[PDB]
RNA sequence: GCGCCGGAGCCUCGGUUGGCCUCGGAUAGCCGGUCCCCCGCCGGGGUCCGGUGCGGAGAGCCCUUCGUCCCGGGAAACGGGGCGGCCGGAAAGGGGGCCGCCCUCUCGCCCGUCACGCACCGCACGUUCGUGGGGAACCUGGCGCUAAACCAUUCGUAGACGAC
RNA sequence: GCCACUUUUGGUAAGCAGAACUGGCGCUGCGGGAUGAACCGAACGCCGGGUUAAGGCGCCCGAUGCCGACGCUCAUCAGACC
RNA sequence: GCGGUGCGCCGCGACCGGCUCCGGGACGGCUGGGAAGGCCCCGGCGGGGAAGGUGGCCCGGGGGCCCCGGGUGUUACAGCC
């Protein structure tokens, strides 16, 4: 069964295209494979968008299927999508991906020197848990 | 075109219990438990209503050769519900002109020896596929009652003995012999 | 230094096309479990094409003829050879680089298998079309070892299930270790979270 | 044009490399398929052909024209001394076939069986299995042997025992015996190896293998007749008398 | 104390179907598979390194058996990040599918 | 004409040259569809030679301009009347499309005419394209988008971006 | 005069320049936990709680190499390195895990204090797997082995000659 | 002498025989049409760089390893380029 | 020191010119003196229109006031032209 449905008023993260990496709000459905869309609080101008570049997410904001960009902006900033998206787990791992893409050489060194000991402490904690489980097993 | 949505609901009676493991269905009721694996048919199976009243199958974006599979799932599921609540009884009768067909049931329903068909000495041993039972009935002269849950096993075991009792190399329009399916129906009437 | 590819779910020539070019580029490729390779189109068309390949035969001496290899691994080897230029030294060096097995033998059961999504049947076929299993076609056409390979694959699936349970309980110990030690690795964790490795 | 009068084909293509065979004694290409219900039994033997003889017997087959009459029938006598078991061979089933796992011989091996490992028994100093037979009378050695019998119990599927003829009982010139793997078809791998190692190093006669009134299959190389033409080998029709370059 | 060259594979010469032009190598560089990513590698010093039987000199060191054929990386080749290259001597066809180093030091960063 | 890219709508007018017979000819106007104005003026002289007694030489263009879509942010239904040549005999058609722009609907018309009927753009000649309100729509594949509560998922998301990870360890997920 | 275990070099073939030690599998569905519930020789199902453009992520994980010198903090103490016994492998068999041992260490890792190490004067094949594969004699010991094949003769189950 | 677009005669027809216009082959390589006297592109001193034509871009085999667009299509004889 | 000529061999760099393939900024013209869209209905004042019909009302059922289905009708607690 399904849980994300293309309908009037779903926001969708966009995979690729000109507007890669932004949310849009799907307004109306043109074809089997294309839809009139508008992200008004994220600078996506009112346009058509094929479905196979947009990843529909779990935020539905209610407005009619012919409403103008004024009312789409009203529903967007009343539902306050731009903080729910920054708070959800999707954009946290998007932004973490962008952080380690942005990672310079010197902080790549710092991350190496950090995560070496951050794994050493884990590894000896793991093996002392293992010997504790052995002494409880016998 | 492709139709954007085609759905049908199937009403599930109070005594029977369907449930879902993904796309396959399992049915528990009075007579037994019967499952079927629909993993070749590419649909959505919602089990809606609390007290589990309706099984709604829906297909999104289908051509007509695959929208045809929408209510055939409904037919298989409601045939399954009929076979679990009430069961299936195929009464197939023996028809002969001169030589009587001797049907003797072995291993309590599971094998049928058919003898003296057209007078010939070759014994026809037909095995019921597992889960159905053949029996020579009373209050009818030459009848074979095939009882089971699922119609594919019942009617297929019937069709095996109907394809066994066949007249070959002669005129089938004159030689009307063999056992033929007479009365399809139900073990326990509603 | 060696690609180990799984063969389950991959189309025959659509996998052989990536493998052929990748071996001409100097890799060493081990395509393993080649009785799970799918072929598109239905089973009866596919075995009719293979029986046509069997009927094509040198007339005066079939000992010189096309050696129809019946094993699934060697059907896939023959189709990679069809895509490679095997009459010359670089194509023969490519066929020396390629190794192909039926089932998953003990050199490679203890390794992790790759997959190619660009050749994979869940991607490159419509879901209502018919496909055909190369292992069942090869058994159907004269390969003799479906049963023994199936039992050996059942054995290795059991032993890999034991390995996977132990790896699960190790990683449970790892996360319980992290939750026990986060107070004194917190200064090492947050410098990884600010560089986007850990959110 | 076509063939004027259709006639069936001379000879058979099934037996096609009509060559001198590589092996002198005939080998078994297939034993009977074992089923674990039976008791364990050897599924072959090995005896030597002596000659030909009549019999006279009364045939009791109902419905023939020879029912309760009295035929004569040609018989063949295969002199068949009891064979001596010398070692057992295990086999594991592989996706490439069925390969041999671990051959284990007996301690004492008769000299007529030892002759088989020598192309010249005269000039050799007869050193075969002398380092191997020491693996039985020391404790580390028979611990190694119990280890690989335990391995053959775990990993093998078919088990076949080496047995040789007992040539010193035959009126022949040769002394070098014949060795053969005979498949032990019967119970499980455990019961199979138990039977095989308890009858290791000792004899087994004919009657434990075959019973009287039992159809068997006979394997061997034919009587060699030399390099011969198409008329005497393939039985084609002789061309007529008038033929210039031979008929 | 580590590697200072990118890994590349000598895929072939610059060739038509019934004609090859041995003055231009085709290099497939590992990791880059698109023309937006191939722009870093233009004008880089690339080198085919091989051993031989008898000793040759080595600049800043002892005579040893390793030898080179140096070259530049001229321009991209096709959409898949395949690149062209030109070398001082044209490469032997031994090198088809062997590891040509692509250095970093003609740097534009 | 080959239907290269998206078509554009050209309003193009023309007339005969002034003759001593009549001082001024009447002016003739067409909505035509072409990739650019050169092939547009060619198609104009094609249809006006097919209708009137007018040619490239005895006539002249007056204004070949483009009509922009007067409301390109509202999805609209388009009824398109057609006249195309099969392998055997020509046929009149009425096809409905659903698009933002009139030129986009006529581009889509040429595309699925070439798809379904193998009709090529020299064979297909247009005659009347109008914007049709949602109750006058006759075609089922267009009418089944006329729901204010339209709702459908995207069931089998086939994997785009295949060769970026080419040799990976994960089987791809096609449920989103 | 040969094979195993325990040194410096010579000839030749070259390719390489960190490892990834593994569930099964679905794709209109998955992954991970809990077990409070129920059975089987820990496994499996049900309920429930998490994630699901996969983050328990191959867009990934592990290791990370300038060296030494003092002294200080965090981590470690149960750990590092080095001899006996227990098992784990057959499809083409695992250089793995475990119990102690006499030894020795606060050295290994992360932040700091302190300087030193041809700073070879801007310049290429540098940095590895490398005790690499194959071939010769120099070699010093110890535990071990002193065989067959072919011709020739013979047989005649075989045979053109070989072969058998 | 031969071939080819179109015109055209005889013959059912022909990789047949006979003409007209023009271009080719013969005398002519080269890229493409897998293969090839004539077809498509194009005519040539020996070379370096760039770019194209016709034809192409899963692999042989250079180039689609585009997150190419819209449809049609199931073949137990699929279809695939003057 | 100046001018010419060259380095035994292997290499590197610099700027200048020619020929090319790209990349990145920025400015302007024309058009229906662009078309639409943005902000000041829930742009201003009155007037209408229907539907891919929002409220509300009714009918039905899945529930625990929400959702779903159908009907009515014209801005209402959504909007469009
Ligand atoms: Mg008759
Ligand atoms: Mg005939
Ligand atoms: Mg004569
Ligand atoms: Mg080196
Ligand atoms: Mg002519
Ligand atoms: Mg000329
Ligand atoms: Mg020419
Ligand atoms: Mg051709
Ligand atoms: Mg031309
Ligand atoms: Mg032309
Ligand atoms: Mg050139
Ligand atoms: Mg080609």
Maximum CA extent, chain A: 72
Q: How far is the CA of E66 from the centre of ligand 4 (A)?
A: 7
Interface touch C102/D93, C-beta < 8 Å: no
DSSP state of E90: P
Q: What one-character-per-residue DSSP string does chain A give?
A: -----EETTEEEEE-SSTTTT-EEEEEEE-SSSEEEEEETTTTEEEEEEEGGGEEEEEEE----TT--HHHHHHHHHHHTHHHHHHHSHHHHHHHHHHHHHH--HHHHHHHHHHHHHHHHHHHHHHHHHHHHHHHHH-
Question: Strand H and chain C: which residues 10-29 have CB closer than 7 Å?
Answer: 13, 16-18, 20-21, 24
Q: How far is the CA of B60 from the centre of ligand 6 (A)?
A: 69
The resolution in Å comes to: 3.3
Maximum CA extent, chain D: 82
Chain B touched by A32 (CB under 8 Å): yes
Chain length of chain F: 176
CA distance F4 to F114: 13
CA distance F58 to C184: 93
Sign of CA dihedral B161, B163, B166, B172: positive
Chain length of chain A: 138
CA distance B71 to B57: 8
CA distance C185 to C182: 5
| Exposed e or buried b per residue across D54-69, where buried means at least 16 C-beta atoms within 10 angstroms of its C-beta | eeeeeeeeeeeeeeee
Phi, psi at residue B15, to the nearest 5°? -90, -10
- How far lies C119's CA from each of B169, C38, C102, D237, in Å? 53, 10, 19, 60
Q: Give residue for tokens 């528990």.
A: B28
This structure was determined by cryo-EM
DSSP helix/strand/coil, F111: helix
Sign of CA dihedral F12, F16, F22, F24: positive
Compute the radius of gyration of chain E from its Cα atoms: 14
Q: Give residue for tokens 């004027």.
A: D4
Angle between helices C89-97 and C72-83 (to 10 degrees): 150
CA distance C33 to C100: 8
Rounded to a whole number of angstroms, the distance from the CA of C177 to the nearest CA of chain A is: 6
In A, minimum Cα distance to C170 occurs at A126
Q: Give residue for tokens 């075109």.
A: B1
C-alpha count within 13 angstroms, C-beta hemisphere, residue C45: 7
- Do C159 and C69 contact (CB within 8 A), yes or no? no
CA distance F88 to F85: 7
Asked whether residue A109's C-beta has any atom of DNA/RNA strand I within 7 A, the reply is: no
CA distance F78 to F163: 39
Compute the radius of gyration of chain C from its Cα atoms: 22
- Do F106 and F129 contact (CB within 8 A), yes or no? yes
Instruction: Return the closest-CA partner of residue F174 out of F160, F158, F152.
Output: F158
Q: Give residue for tokens 């119970």.
A: D187
DSSP state of B18: E
Q: Give residue for tokens 């380092």.
A: D131
DSSP helix/strand/coil, E7: strand
Interface touch F167/C120, C-beta < 8 Å: no
HEC secondary structure over chain C = CEEEEECCCEEHHHHHHHHHHHHHCCCEEEEECCCCCEEECCHHHHHHHHHHHHHCCCCCCHHHCCCCCCCHHHHHHHHHHHHCCCCCHHHHHHHHHCEECCCCCCCCCCCCCEECHHHEHHHHCCCCCCEEEHHHHHHHHCCCCHHHHHHHHHHHHHHHHHHHHHHHHHHHHHHHHHHHHHHHHHHHHHHHHCCCCCC
D151: nearest nucleotide, CA–C1' criterion: G90
Interface touch C176/A114, C-beta < 8 Å: no
Q: What are residue F125's DSSP bridge partners?
A: F83
> Please, is F169 exposed, middle or buried when counting C-beta atoms within 10 Å of its C-beta (0-12, 13-18, 19+)?
exposed
Question: Strand I and chain F: which residues 72-101 have CB closer than 7 Å?
Answer: 72-75
CA C161 to chain centre: 19
Output B158-167 pairs: Cβ under 8 A, ≥24 positions apart: B158/B90, B158/B92, B160/B126, B160/B127, B160/B128, B160/B129, B161/B92, B161/B112, B161/B114, B161/B124, B161/B126, B161/B134, B162/B92, B164/B114, B164/B124, B164/B126, B165/B101, B165/B114, B165/B117, B165/B124, B167/B118
Q: Give the residue whose CA sits closest to G51 at C1'.
A: A89
Interface touch C127/B66, C-beta < 8 Å: no
Q: What are residue B111's DSSP bridge partners?
A: B106, B127
Phi, psi at residue F170, to the nearest 5°? -95, 135
CB count in 10 Å sphere of residue F103: 22
Q: What one-character-per-residue DSSP string does D116-168 give?
A: GG-S-TTTS---TTTTTGGGSSSHHHHHHHHHHHHHHHHH-SEEEEEEE--GG
E77: nearest nucleotide, CA–C1' criterion: H63
Which of A89, A91, A125 to mutate to probe the C interface, most C CBs <10 Å?
A: A125
CA distance B45 to B64: 19
Which of F75, F103, F175 to mutate to probe the A interface, most A CBs <10 Å?
A: F75
H or E element at residue B77: helix B70-85
DSSP state of D239: P
Instruction: Return the closest-CA partner of residue F96 out of F121, F76, F114, F116.
Output: F76
In C, minimum Cα distance to E26 occurs at C25
- Do F27 and F62 contact (CB within 8 A), yes or no? yes
CB count in 10 Å sphere of residue A97: 13
Sign of CA dihedral D62, D66, D69, D70: negative
- Do C53 and C66 contact (CB within 8 A), yes or no? yes
CA distance B155 to C159: 43
CA distance D86 to D204: 11
A15: nearest nucleotide, CA–C1' criterion: H67
Chain C touched by D17 (CB under 8 Å): no
HEC secondary structure over D21-89 = CCCCCCCCCCCCCCCCCCCCEECCCCCEEEEEECCEEECCCCCCCCCCCEEECCEEEEECCCEEEEEEE
CA A6 to chain centre: 17
Tokens of D11: 């000879």
CB count in 10 Å sphere of residue C197: 17
CB count in 10 Å sphere of residue C114: 19
CB count in 10 Å sphere of residue B94: 23
CA distance F17 to F25: 7
Tokens of F156: 């089998």
Q: Report the distance from CA of residue C177 to the C1' of nucleotide G73 in Å, as an integer.
A: 25
- Do C197 and A93 contact (CB within 8 A), yes or no? no
Instruction: Return the closest-CA partner of residue B183 out of B88, B83, B84.
Output: B88
Q: How far is the CA of F7 from the centre of ligand 10 (A)?
A: 30
* Residues from chain F contacting residue B1 (CB–CB below 8 Å): 140-141, 144
Instruction: Return the closest-CA partner of residue C119 out of C1, C21, C2, C25.
Output: C21
Tokens of D141: 């050695």
Compute the radius of gyration of chain D from its Cα atoms: 24
Instruction: Return the closest-CA partner of residue C37 out of C19, C18, C20, C14.
Output: C14
H or E element at residue D203: strand D203-204
Cβ neighbours of residue B159 closer than 8 Å, sequence gap 6 or more: B181
- Do F103 and F48 contact (CB within 8 A), yes or no? no
CA distance E10 to E47: 11
């Amino acid at each position: 069964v399904f849980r994300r449905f293309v309908e009037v008023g779903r926001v969708a993260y966009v995979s690729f295209g000109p507007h890669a990496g932004k949310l849009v709000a799907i307004v109306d459905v043109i074809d089997q494979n294309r839809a009139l869309v508008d992200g008004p609080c994220t600078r996506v101008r009112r346009q058509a968008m094929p479905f196979k570049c947009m990843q529909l997410t779990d935020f539905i904001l209610k407005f009619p299927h012919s409403a103008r960009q004024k009312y789409v902006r009203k529903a967007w900033e009343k539902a306050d999508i731009n903080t729910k998206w920054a708070a959800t787990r999707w954009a946290k791992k998007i932004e973490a991906r962008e952080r380690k893409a942005k990672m310079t050489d010197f902080d790549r060194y710092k991350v190496m020197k950090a995560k070496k000991m951050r794994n050493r402490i884990i590894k000896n904690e793991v093996k002392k848990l293992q010997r504790a489980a052995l002494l409880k097993a016998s | 075109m492709k139709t954007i949505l085609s759905n049908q609901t199937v009403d599930i009676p109070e005594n029977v219990d369907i449930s879902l493991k993904g796309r396959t269905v399992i049915v528990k009721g009075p007579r037994g438990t019967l499952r079927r694996d629909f993993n070749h048919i590419n649909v959505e199976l919602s089990l809606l209503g609390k007290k589990k009243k309706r099984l709604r199958v829906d297909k999104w974006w289908g051509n007509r050769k695959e929208l045809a599979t929408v209510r055939t799932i409904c037919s298989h599921v409601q045939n399954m519900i009929k076979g679990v609540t009430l069961g299936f009884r195929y009464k197939m009768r023996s028809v002969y002109a001169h030589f009587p067909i001797n049907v003797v049931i072995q291993e309590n329903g599971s094998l049928v020896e058919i003898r003296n068909f057209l007078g010939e000495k070759y014994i026809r041993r037909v095995r019921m596929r597992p889960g159905v039972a053949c029996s020579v009935s009373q209050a009818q002269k030459d009848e074979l009652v095939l009882e089971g849950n699922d119609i594919e096993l019942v009617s297929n075991s019937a069709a095996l003995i109907q394809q066994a009792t066949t007249v070959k190399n002669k005129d089938i329009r004159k030689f009307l012999d063999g056992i033929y399916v007479s009365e399809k129906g139900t073990v326990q009437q509603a | 230094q060696v690609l180990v590819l799984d063969g389950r779910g991959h189309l025959l020539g659509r996998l052989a096309a990536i493998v052929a070019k990748q071996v001409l580029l100097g890799r060493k490729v081990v395509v393993v479990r080649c009785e799970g390779i799918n072929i598109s189109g239905n089973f009866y068309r596919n075995k009719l094409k293979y029986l046509a390949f069997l009927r094509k035969r040198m007339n005066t001496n079939p000992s010189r003829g096309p050696y129809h290899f019946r094993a699934p691994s060697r059907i896939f080897w023959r189709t990679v050879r069809g895509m490679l230029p095997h009459k010359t030294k670089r194509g023969q060096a490519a066929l020396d680089r390629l190794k192909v097995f039926d089932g998953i033998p003990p050199p490679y059961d203890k390794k992790k298998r790759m997959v190619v999504p660009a050749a994979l049947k869940v991607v490159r076929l419509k879901p209502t079309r018919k496909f055909a299993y190369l292992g069942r076609l090869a058994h159907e056409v004269g390969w003799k070892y479906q049963a023994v390979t199936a039992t050996l694959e059942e054995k290795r699936k059991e032993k890999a299930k034991i390995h996977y349970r132990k790896k699960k309980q190790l990683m449970r110990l790892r996360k319980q270790a992290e939750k026990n030690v986060e107070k004194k690795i917190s200064k090492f964790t947050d410098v990884l979270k600010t560089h986007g490795l850990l959110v | 044009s076509h063939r004027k009068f259709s006639a069936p084909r001379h000879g058979s293509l099934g037996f096609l490399p009509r060559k001198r065979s590589s092996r002198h004694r005939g080998k078994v290409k297939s034993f009977p398929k074992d089923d674990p219900s039976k008791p364990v039994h050897l599924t072959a033997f090995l005896g030597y052909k002596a000659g030909m003889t009549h019999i006279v017997r009364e045939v009791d087959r109902p419905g023939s024209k020879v029912n309760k009459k009295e035929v004569v029938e040609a018989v063949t006598i295969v002199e068949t001394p009891p064979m001596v078991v010398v070692g057992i061979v295990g086999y594991v089933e592989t996706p490439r076939g069925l390969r041999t796992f671990k051959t284990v011989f007996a301690e004492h091996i008769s000299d007529e069986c030892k002759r088989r490992f020598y192309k010249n028994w005269h000039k050799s100093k007869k050193k075969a299995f002398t380092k191997y037979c020491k693996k039985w009378q020391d404790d580390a050695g028979k611990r190694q042997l119990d280890k690989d019998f335990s391995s053959m119990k775990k990993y093998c599927q078919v088990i076949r025992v080496l047995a040789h003829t007992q040539m010193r009982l035959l009126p022949l010139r040769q002394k070098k015996a014949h060795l053969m793997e005979i498949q032990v078809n019967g119970g499980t791998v455990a019961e199979k190896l138990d039977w095989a190692r308890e009858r290791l190093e000792q004899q087994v006669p004919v009657s434990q293998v075959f019973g009287q009134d039992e159809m068997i299959d006979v394997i061997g190389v034919t009587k060699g007749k030399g390099y011969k033409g198409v008329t005497s080998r393939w039985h084609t029709k002789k061309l007529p008398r008038k033929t210039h370059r031979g008929l | 104390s580590g590697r200072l060259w990118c890994k590349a594979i000598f895929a072939g010469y610059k060739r038509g179907l019934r004609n090859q032009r041995e003055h231009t190598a085709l290099l497939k560089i590992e990791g880059v598979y698109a023309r937006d990513e191939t722009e870093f590698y233009l004008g880089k010093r690339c080198a085919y390194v091989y051993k031989a039987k008898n000793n040759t000199v080595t600049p800043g060191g002892k005579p040893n058996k390793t030898r080179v054929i140096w070259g530049k990386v001229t321009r991209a080749h096709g959409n898949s990040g395949m690149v062209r290259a030109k070398f001082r001597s044209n490469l032997p066809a031994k090198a088809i599918g062997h590891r040509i180093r692509v250095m970093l030091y003609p740097s534009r960063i | 004409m080959k239907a290269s890219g998206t078509l554009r709508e050209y309003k193009v007018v023309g007339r005969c040259l002034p003759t001593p017979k009549c001082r001024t000819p009447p002016l003739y106007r067409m909505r035509i569809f072409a990739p650019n104005h050169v092939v547009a003026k060619s198609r104009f002289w094609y249809f006006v030679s097919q209708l009137k007694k007018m040619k490239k030489s005895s006539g002249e263009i007056v204004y070949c301009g483009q009509v922009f879509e007067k409301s390109p942010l509202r999805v609209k239904n388009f009824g398109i009347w057609l006249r195309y040549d099969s392998r055997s005999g020509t046929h009149n058609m009425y096809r409905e499309y659903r698009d933002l722009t009139t030129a986009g609907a006529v581009t889509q018309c040429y595309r699925d005419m070439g798809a379904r009927h193998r009709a090529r753009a020299h064979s297909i000649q247009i005659m009347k394209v109008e914007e049709i309100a949602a109750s006058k729509c006759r075609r089922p594949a267009v009418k089944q988008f006329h729901d204010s509560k339209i709702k459908f998922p995207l069931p089998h998301r086939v994997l785009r971006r295949q060769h970026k990870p080419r040799f990976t360890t994960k089987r791809p997920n096609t449920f989103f």
